[PDB]
C-alpha cells in the first residue's frame, strides 16, 4: 500500500487551500484516512481524518476552517482549508490510521508530502537597498558590503556583483517568505577595506518575473 498526495504549489492569501490524496495497493475501509502538516513554528500537527462512510474528525485548533471530502469510487480523500494565512504555510502530508482504540494508535503509510506556501497573488517588483560596509567580516582586510532585495514576488531573483567581474567573496543568502507574502534576500560581498572609497561596488539585481533590473551602488557611510 502506497500513499501519494497532490495540490497547488502556491496558495494566494485569504483564499482556500485545496488538496487531494490518492491511495494505491488497497481499498479504503478499515482505516481513518488522515491529513497532517509540518512546519517550524508550529511543529508537526494533525489536521484531521475521514472514514470511507463520510464521517470526519477535525483538529479543534483549526475547525470551521477545515473541510475534508472523500471518494470511495476513486481511492482518494480531499482537504479544503479556507481563510488561509501565513501560518498555514507548511508541508502537507496524508496518512493512515488503524481503525480502533486511538490511544495506542499511530500514523502509518505517510505520503511524500506536498509543500504549500501562502503568497501575495500578484507579481511584485523588488526594492533594492544598499548595505553599507561594516567590520566583523572575515578579518582585515576587509569589509562586508551588501544589497537587501526586499519585498518581491515571485522568485527567483539574480544578484551579481559589478556585472559579474566580481565572484570571489560573494555570499547570496536564500530568500525569506514573509507574513507579507513577499520574498526578501540579502547578498553580501567581502572586499579589501583598503579598496573602499576608490573601488566601486554595484550589485546587479534581476527580477525577470517583473522585468526589473536594479543596479544599486553601495557607498560607505560618512
Amino acid at each position: 500500500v502506497q500513499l501519494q498526495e497532490s495540490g497547488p504549489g502556491v496558495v494566494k492569501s485569504s483564499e482556500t487551500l485545496s488538496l487531494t490524496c490518492t491511495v494505491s495497493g488497497g481499498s479504503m475501509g478499515g482505516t481513518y484516512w488522515s491529513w497532517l502538516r509540518l512546519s517550524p513554528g508550529k511543529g508537526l500537527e494533525w489536521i484531521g481524518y475521514i472514514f470511507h462512510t463520510g464521517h470526519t474528525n477535525y483538529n479543534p485548533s483549526l475547525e470551521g476552517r477545515v473541510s475534508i471530502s472523500v471518494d470511495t469510487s476513486e481511492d482518494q480523500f480531499s482537504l479544503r482549508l479556507r481563510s488561509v494565512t501565513a501560518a498555514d504555510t507548511a508541508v502537507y502530508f496524508c496518512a493512515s490510521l488503524p481503525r480502533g482504540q486511538l490511544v495506542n494508535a499511530y500514523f502509518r503509510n505517510w505520503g511524500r508530502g506536498t509543500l504549500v506556501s501562502v503568497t501575495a497573488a500578484s507579481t511584485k517588483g523588488p526594492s533594492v537597498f544598499p548595505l553599507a560596509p561594516s567590520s566583523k567580516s572575515t578579518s582585515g582586510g576587509t569589509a562586508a558590503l551588501g544589497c537587501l532585495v526586499k519585498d518581491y514576488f515571485p522568485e527567483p531573483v539574480t544578484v551579481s556583483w559589478n556585472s559579474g567581474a566580481l565572484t570571489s567573496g560573494v555570499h547570496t543568502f536564500p530568500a525569506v517568505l514573509q507574513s507579507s507574502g513577499l520574498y526578501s534576500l540579502s547578498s553580501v560581498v567581502t572586499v579589501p577595506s583598503s579598496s573602499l572609497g576608490t573601488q566601486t561596488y554595484i550589485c546587479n539585481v534581476n527580477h525577470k518575473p517583473s522585468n526589473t533590473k536594479v543596479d544599486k551602488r553601495v557607498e560607505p557611510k560618512s
Binding site: 500513499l3 509540518l38 517550524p40 511543529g43 508537526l44 500537527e45 494533525w46 474528525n57 483538529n59 479543534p60 485548533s61 502530508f93 486511538l102 490511544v103 495506542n104 494508535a105 499511530y106 500514523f107 502509518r108 505517510w110 505520503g111 511524500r112 508530502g113 526594492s127 537597498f129 544598499p130 548595505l131 553599507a132 561594516s134 566583523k136 567580516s137 572575515t138 562586508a144 551588501g146 537587501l148 526586499k150 555570499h171 543568502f173 536564500p174 530568500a175 525569506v176 517568505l177 514573509q178 507574513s179 526578501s184 534576500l185 540579502s186 553580501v188
Partner: protein, 208 residues
C-alpha cells in the same frame, strides 16, 4: 504541549537521548516519528518502548515518568532526522512534540559568524526599516535567533530562514526584523542574538 530539546547532536559512535516532557507526558502511551526532508515520515517507537518492523536494535526508550525518552545507541548517519513525539488526547485527539533536530556529525562543529546590518537611510526614506542578521559558517545547521529592542525581547516583525547547506559543507541563515522608522529611532539599540549549540553571539546596532 510536549516540550522537546530543539536540537541534539552526536558523533557517529556515541548514543543520543531525546526527551518529550510536556504536561500530561502522557499517562502511559507515547509514539515517535522520524522525519527526513522530501521523505515520508515513519514510526520508530510506540506505546513506550516497542520497536516496529524494520527498526535496528539501537533504537529504544521509555517513560520515567512523566517523561518519555527515545534513545539511539551507536548512532548511524542515516539516523540524521527530525524526531517528533506524539500522544492521544481526549479533546485534541493527537498532541505532538515540539520536534528535535538530530544532526549527527558529520564534521567538527563550526561556530556561527553573525553579521548585523542597520536599516539603510534609503529604506528609512521609503518609510521602512529592516535589520538584517546574517549567520554563516556554522555546524550543525540548527540555530536559534532572538531579537532585542534595548533589553526587551521582540516577537513581532521577525522573519528567520531555515539554515541552508553551503559549499563549505557548513550552514548559513538570515533573520530580518521589520520596524517603522519611528520604532527604530525611538529605541536606543537593537540586537540580533544567535544561539548555536550552547554558545550565543549577540550583535547590536544603534541609530545614529
Amino acid at each position: 504541549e510536549l516540550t522537546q530539546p530543539p536540537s541534539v547532536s552526536v558523533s557517529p559512535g556515541q548514543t543520543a537521548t531525546i526527551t518529550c516532557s510536556g504536561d500530561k507526558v502522557a499517562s502511559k502511551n507515547v509514539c515517535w516519528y522520524q522525519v527526513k526532508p522530501g521523505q515520508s515520515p515513519e514510526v520508530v517507537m510506540y506505546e513506550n518502548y516497542k520497536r516496529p518492523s524494520g527498526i535496528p536494535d539501537r533504537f529504544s526508550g521509555s517513560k520515567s515518568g512523566s517523561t518519555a525518552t527515545l534513545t539511539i545507541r551507536g548512532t548511524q548517519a542515516t539516523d540524521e532526522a527530525d524526531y517528533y513525539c506524539q500522544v492521544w488526547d481526549s479533546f485534541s485527539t493527537f498532541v505532538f512534540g515540539s520536534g528535535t533536530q538530530v544532526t549527527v556529525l558529520g564534521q567538527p562543529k563550526a561556530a556561527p559568524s553573525v553579521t548585523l546590518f542597520p536599516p539603510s537611510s534609503e529604506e528609512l526614506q521609503a518609510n521602512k526599516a529592516t535589520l538584517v542578521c546574517l549567520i554563516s559558517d556554522f555546524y550543525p545547521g540548527a540555530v536559534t535567533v532572538a531579537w532585542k529592542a534595548d533589553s526587551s525581547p521582540v516577537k513581532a516583525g521577525v522573519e528567520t530562514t531555515t539554515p541552508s547547506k553551503q559549499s563549505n559543507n557548513k550552514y548559513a541563515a538570515s533573520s530580518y526584523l521589520s520596524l517603522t522608522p519611528e520604532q527604530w529611532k525611538s529605541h536606543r539599540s537593537y540586537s540580533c542574538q544567535v544561539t548555536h549549540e550552547g554558545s550565543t553571539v549577540e550583535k547590536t546596532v544603534a541609530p545614529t
